């Protein structure tokens, strides 16, 4: 070759994973969440860096600081409400991502699946610390009760909760830590994303049918660049619709109140992304039992590869899993609901059966259904 810009630079060749790559034809709209996933990562970052261009990480000021970003600073208001709302999207997008993987068996790509999982959990940490930066009543308490929920561990716990906090409570020491880790996680996560992409590039994108498409492959540039741009267009739409028309709507927490360590919103709860986690902890009487089961909620993802029982990696042709897939999703919605619920009988009893349903759906029902379907097809 001569003057083929692409492979001339070696660097620019590495970018031909976007333009020249084999991309399956058939492909639900669901896959745009990968790309959007990145979109969100880049938006949070640009946004973060500007907010962290006018934010301070002290007890005294932090609340003020945010308050000042939203008042005196030019276009700081949208930047901040764009950053808050974004993170919602970021999660809304994440959970589409994992749904798709669950449903069409994209998770067969074990190595890719394991990175995903790390991805998911890393963002999860991020979101948990950022929400605490503004140091408002919800944030303040939410950190205590989550962090303390780590003191369940018998031997260490207790010592360890105190190291993480940098003291006995959550004063300045903790507050500056979260500021620093919030800042540096996303950068580390981008490396991961790319590592994730790396592995995925070695086997390409699965489809709704569930069969290889090698016999049908398309230009990513021609087709999938417009799709992705279009995806954006809708993604942004949702992010501005939220951010411009109903800034607070999706941000359940109304606690714009500077944190007073003796005061407590009897209704303490994580955000929508973390709502499911809070609910899981509630169904178990015992503390430690609840922390294990909380971890297992999320950490149970990496099992599913091994659980796979059918011969069709595609759920598309297996009714029965399509039914229990949906139910899990609706069980997941049900759990999210509990999250914002008084921890009383009505909700307790419900959550408990939802938390068993979720693990059944994932651990036991689906896997069996797989088999069945295989046997009805005579496979």
């Amino acid at each position: 070759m001569t003057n083929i810009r692409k492979s001339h630079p070696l660097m620019k060749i590495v970018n031909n994973a976007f333009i020249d790559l084999p991309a399956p034809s058939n492909i639900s709209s669901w896959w745009n969440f990968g790309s959007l996933l990145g979109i969100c990562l880049i938006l949070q970052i640009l946004t973060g860096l500007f907010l962290a261009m006018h934010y301070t990480s002290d007890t005294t000021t932090a609340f003020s600081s945010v308050t000042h970003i939203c008042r005196d600073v030019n276009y700081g208001w949208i930047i901040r409400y764009m950053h808050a709302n974004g993170a919602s999207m970021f999660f809304i997008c994440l959970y589409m991502h994992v749904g798709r993987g669950l449903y069409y068996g994209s998770y067969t790509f074990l190595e890719t699946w394991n990175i995903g999982v790390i991805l998911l959990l890393t963002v999860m940490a991020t979101a948990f610390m950022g929400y605490v930066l503004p140091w408002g009543q919800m944030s303040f308490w939410g950190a205590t009760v989550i962090t303390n929920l780590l003191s369940a561990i018998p031997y260490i716990g207790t010592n360890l909760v105190e190291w993480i906090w940098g003291g006995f409570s959550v004063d300045k020491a903790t507050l500056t830590r979260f500021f620093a880790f919030h800042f540096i996680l996303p950068f580390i996560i981008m490396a991961i994303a790319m590592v994730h992409l790396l592995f995925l590039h070695e086997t390409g994108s699965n489809n709704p049918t569930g069969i290889s498409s090698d016999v049908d492959k398309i230009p990513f540039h021609p087709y999938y660049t417009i799709k992705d741009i279009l995806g954006a267009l809708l993604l942004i739409l949702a992010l501005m619709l939220l951010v411009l028309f109903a800034p607070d709507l999706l941000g359940d927490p109304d606690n714009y109140t500077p944190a007073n360590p003796l005061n407590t919103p009897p209704h303490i709860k994580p955000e929508w992304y973390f709502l499911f986690a809070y609910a899981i902890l509630r169904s178990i009487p015992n503390k430690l039992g609840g922390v294990l089961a909380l971890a297992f909620s999320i950490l149970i993802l990496a099992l599913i590869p091994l659980l796979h029982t059918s011969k069709q990696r595609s759920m598309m042709f297996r009714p029965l899993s399509q039914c229990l897939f949906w139910a899990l999703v609706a069980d997941l919605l049900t759990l999210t609901w509990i999250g914002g619920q008084p921890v009383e009988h009505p909700y307790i009893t419900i959550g408990q059966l939802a938390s068993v349903l979720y693990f059944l759906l994932i651990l036991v029902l689906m896997p069996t259904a797989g088999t069945i379907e295989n046997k009805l097809l005579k496979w």
């Binding site: 398309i218 417009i226 279009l230 411009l244 800034p247 606690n255 714009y256 008084p342």
Partner: protein, 241 residues
Amino acid sequence: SDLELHPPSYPWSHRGLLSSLDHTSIRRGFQVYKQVCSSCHSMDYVAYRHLVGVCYTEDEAKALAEEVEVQDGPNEDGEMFMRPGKLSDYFPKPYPNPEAARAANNGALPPDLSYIVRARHGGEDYVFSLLTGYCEPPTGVSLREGLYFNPYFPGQAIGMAPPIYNEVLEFDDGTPATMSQVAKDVCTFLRWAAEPEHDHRKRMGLKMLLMMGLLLPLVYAMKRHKWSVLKSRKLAYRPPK
């Protein structure tokens, strides 16, 4: 574990996506806060920047901000020689510091109204239905004098003196100062104060909504053309022999 009553979706000029804030309401409301409310509740992030937000001129608010620094002035902030003039000063803190504030109101601590509509779950509805909601304690109920009974407080009891009562103040124009009429204006100034960005955002949202819609339509069409060839194409298997 007491049922909490919840706020109506009270008819507001701004309830709607495109609807915007009514400054006259703001204006009115302001005064309400300043006369009725400045006494025990503070608004720290609010400067004397109503100018364009509240239609108070620069000269108007300068003057309005001058007297507030003459009486409550920077002597409560720590500026010894301070008097009339300045505009960067923020609304004057009812009391030196929180602890005081609770003493004046006996254990309770007057919440900063800055963010209260946004701050209290349930928005300006709750705030309006709190102030305007004050009914007779329920047969067989007991009440410590401070513990006035209010139909909309979580714990079913609030330390609030007559928030607002008819003819509490008087507005320039002549707006009929009804308990409620004043509340409608007080809330609004809170909502404007609570979410200054939101007022600007609604106008922006309309612009954003049209552009996004137009962009989305073209993209679907633009997107369709690029992907048309794969869709248009029909492949027919050909037998080897």
